[PDB]
Amino acid sequence: DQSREQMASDVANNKSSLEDGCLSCGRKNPVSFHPLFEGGLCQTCRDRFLELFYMYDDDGYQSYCTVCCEGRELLLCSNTSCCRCFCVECLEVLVGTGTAAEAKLQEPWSCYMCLPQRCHGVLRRRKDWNVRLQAFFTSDT
Amino acid sequence: DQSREQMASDVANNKSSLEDGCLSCGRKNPVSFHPLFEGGLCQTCRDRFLELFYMYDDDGYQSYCTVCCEGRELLLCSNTSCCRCFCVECLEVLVGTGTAAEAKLQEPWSCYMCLPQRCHGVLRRRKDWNVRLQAFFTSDT
Amino acid sequence: DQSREQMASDVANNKSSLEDGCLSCGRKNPVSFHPLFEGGLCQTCRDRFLELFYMYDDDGYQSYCTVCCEGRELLLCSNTSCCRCFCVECLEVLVGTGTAAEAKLQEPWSCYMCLPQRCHGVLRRRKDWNVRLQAFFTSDT
Ligand SMILES: [Br-]
Ligand SMILES: [Br-]
Ligand SMILES: [Br-]
Ligand SMILES: [Zn+2]
Ligand SMILES: [Zn+2]
Ligand SMILES: [Zn+2]
Ligand SMILES: [Zn+2]
Ligand SMILES: [Zn+2]
Ligand SMILES: [Zn+2]
Ligand SMILES: [Zn+2]
Ligand SMILES: [Zn+2]
Ligand SMILES: [Zn+2]
């Protein structure tokens, strides 16, 4: 089974497209797409987002990583219009080693949806993220 | 058992949080959140929005209250890019006594999603309403 | 009004409203609305969008016509923030004869969701398309 470290390395070296790996778990030939970041989304990782219990914590931050839906070791966007979260693992594997530690020291921290810069490592916000999100909500499938 | 009048009074006097009452019906400890306004949303009030038949009337205005999903005594946003509706009861209870009558005299009336001002009484548009609405559409539970 | 050619002609010459025909197939008295363009949407044409499997082709353009969901002869929006598609038939019948041929030679082509001009033939982008699309995603029926 393709690790996320292997997927990130192949993407950076133009061996695979982001679209042919699950951005969340690393597996090959996912059925669907992550709507916010360049990358596929497998059926299992897509169902995690749909099947969350509480989507927010008691402080009004999201209870889940925007990329992989993990709830542990979340970095919290300081933009009160956003309140999205990214996990340590996604920062380490998609942006690069040390990103998580650097981000935990930033005061305030702005997430990868809020940053003007579109790409960091193989974490690339979609140019068409808004239309992609509309497409993601359109399908029953 | 908790009335909406009791919930609004406790919120204004910092006795309870908007998030621990249903903004639509007043019930304590709702399961989810109203996506547009600060406030909880119970399972049954959430199901009203999901189970609407016709969402628009013959004049192109929404057939339901943005807060509680009621069809009776709707005020109609005059912004042709919006066409959302708010009922008399939600205005009276969340904004305050006389709001509906004051709104009927406005030349023209702009709804609480269109007004630059975020808060009126305990009706507070979310700073993160757009991300909250994306979270609301993501959930299949 | 039965064929799409008949519906377009009646609309242009003030015999019918766009809202009383299916924008996708031409059928009279459709149950719902097209969320992006003025026009009804019948149950069958609405179900095409809900039952899409792949929303995107291998080049990151949408796999379906924005208006009718079929097409096969898709024109591709050149805006990398959009990547929507419109079929030859929808352009010929809603905008007018020659539109498809003109659009295939245009370098680059901007689709009817991107163009500043709201109206071309009987194709009118909704003033409230964003709120209409939120209403479209709200219904679980
Ligand atoms: Br694999
Ligand atoms: Br949306
Ligand atoms: Br509940
Ligand atoms: Zn996955
Ligand atoms: Zn993550
Ligand atoms: Zn953010
Ligand atoms: Zn309720
Ligand atoms: Zn109401
Ligand atoms: Zn409004
Ligand atoms: Zn139809
Ligand atoms: Zn078409
Ligand atoms: Zn476009």
Side-chain angles (χ1 to χ4, degrees), chain A residues 1-71 74-103 105-141, chain B residues 2-69 71 73-141, chain C residues 1-71 73-101 103-141:
Chain A
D1 259 27
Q2 180 173 265
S3 74
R4 213 133 71 105
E5 290 78 1
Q6 180 59 234
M7 186 192 160
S9 181
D10 287 347
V11 166
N13 293 324
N14 296 317
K15 294 171 76 79
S16 333
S17 169
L18 246 4
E19 304 307 341
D20 302 329
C22 183
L23 197 61
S24 168
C25 73
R27 85 139 43 73
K28 289 189 187 175
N29 198 45
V31 67
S32 191
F33 59 89
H34 199 290
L36 301 186
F37 291 91
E38 291 177 22
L41 200 61
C42 75
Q43 193 58 73
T44 301
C45 291
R46 192 215 168 86
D47 295 344
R48 295 211 166 103
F49 293 104
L50 274 51
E51 297 171 19
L52 281 162
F53 298 80
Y54 298 144
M55 300 191 79
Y56 285 85
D57 67 21
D58 33 26
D59 304 318
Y61 301 90
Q62 292 194 333
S63 63
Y64 64 97
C65 181
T66 287
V67 176
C68 71
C69 209
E70 174 62 53
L74 290 179
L75 290 94
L76 276 51
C77 191
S78 60
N79 180 3
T80 58
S81 293
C82 170
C83 306
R84 293 182 202 271
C85 301
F86 291 75
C87 78
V88 164
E89 194 190 297
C90 286
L91 266 55
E92 288 306 280
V93 182
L94 305 179
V95 182
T97 303
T99 305
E102 289 176 18
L105 270 40
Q106 283 189 280
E107 229 308 301
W109 185 72
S110 289
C111 82
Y112 295 99
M113 287 304 298
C114 293
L115 255 18
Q117 175 169 323
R118 191 178 73 80
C119 305
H120 305 80
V122 303
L123 192 62
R124 311 180 173 149
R125 181 179 57 236
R126 290 191 187 280
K127 296 190 190 168
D128 60 338
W129 67 262
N130 203 286
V131 173
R132 287 267 183 168
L133 201 51
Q134 296 162 33
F136 184 88
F137 300 143
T138 297
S139 27
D140 274 349
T141 56
Chain B
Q2 181 173 264
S3 75
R4 283 222 287 168
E5 179 72 9
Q6 180 59 233
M7 181 188 166
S9 180
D10 290 346
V11 166
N13 288 333
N14 289 315
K15 286 164 67 176
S16 56
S17 165
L18 277 169
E19 302 303 347
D20 298 329
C22 183
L23 197 63
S24 168
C25 73
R27 176 186 200 287
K28 290 186 196 223
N29 305 330
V31 67
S32 196
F33 61 88
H34 197 292
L36 302 188
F37 292 93
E38 294 181 20
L41 199 64
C42 75
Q43 185 62 70
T44 58
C45 291
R46 193 218 171 87
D47 295 336
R48 296 171 187 170
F49 291 104
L50 299 196
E51 293 169 13
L52 283 164
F53 299 80
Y54 296 156
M55 298 212 57
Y56 287 86
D57 67 21
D58 278 41
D59 298 324
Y61 297 91
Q62 292 196 332
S63 64
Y64 63 98
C65 181
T66 288
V67 175
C68 72
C69 207
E73 284 257 66
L74 292 178
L75 288 94
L76 278 50
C77 192
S78 60
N79 182 3
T80 57
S81 293
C82 173
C83 304
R84 292 182 202 269
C85 300
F86 291 74
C87 82
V88 165
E89 190 188 288
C90 288
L91 266 55
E92 288 305 281
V93 186
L94 305 179
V95 184
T97 309
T99 303
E102 213 276 356
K104 283 183 148 69
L105 270 41
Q106 284 191 8
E107 305 189 341
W109 188 69
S110 285
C111 84
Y112 297 101
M113 288 305 292
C114 293
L115 291 167
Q117 175 169 325
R118 191 178 71 79
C119 307
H120 306 79
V122 305
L123 191 64
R124 308 181 177 153
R125 182 178 57 239
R126 289 191 188 277
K127 298 187 186 185
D128 61 337
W129 68 261
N130 206 291
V131 174
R132 288 266 183 168
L133 192 58
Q134 294 163 28
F136 179 95
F137 298 142
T138 299
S139 184
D140 207 26
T141 58
Chain C
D1 314 293
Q2 191 105 80
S3 75
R4 209 134 73 107
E5 288 79 3
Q6 181 60 237
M7 184 190 163
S9 180
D10 286 349
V11 167
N13 299 291
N14 190 38
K15 308 304 187 213
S16 324
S17 165
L18 277 171
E19 302 299 352
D20 300 330
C22 185
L23 198 61
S24 167
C25 73
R27 177 216 186 77
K28 294 194 188 165
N29 58 238
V31 69
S32 196
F33 61 88
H34 197 290
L36 300 188
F37 291 93
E38 291 177 10
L41 199 64
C42 75
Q43 190 61 72
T44 313
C45 292
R46 194 218 163 84
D47 295 342
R48 295 171 188 172
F49 292 103
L50 301 189
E51 294 168 11
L52 253 12
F53 194 64
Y54 298 130
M55 313 289 299
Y56 287 85
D57 68 21
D58 284 31
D59 296 321
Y61 298 91
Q62 293 194 335
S63 62
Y64 63 99
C65 181
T66 288
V67 175
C68 73
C69 205
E70 300 193 308
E73 14 181 41
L74 267 34
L75 290 95
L76 319 184
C77 192
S78 61
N79 182 5
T80 59
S81 292
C82 173
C83 305
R84 292 184 204 267
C85 300
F86 290 75
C87 80
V88 165
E89 191 189 291
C90 285
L91 267 47
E92 289 306 84
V93 185
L94 304 181
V95 183
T97 58
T99 306
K104 284 204 289 284
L105 63 69
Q106 201 136 73
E107 161 63 315
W109 183 70
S110 288
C111 81
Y112 296 102
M113 289 302 297
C114 292
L115 254 18
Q117 174 55 244
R118 195 172 74 76
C119 308
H120 305 81
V122 302
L123 192 66
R124 292 191 170 171
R125 183 179 55 238
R126 288 192 188 275
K127 292 184 177 191
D128 59 338
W129 68 261
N130 204 284
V131 174
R132 287 265 181 170
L133 198 56
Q134 294 164 35
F136 187 92
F137 301 145
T138 297
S139 189
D140 204 28
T141 58

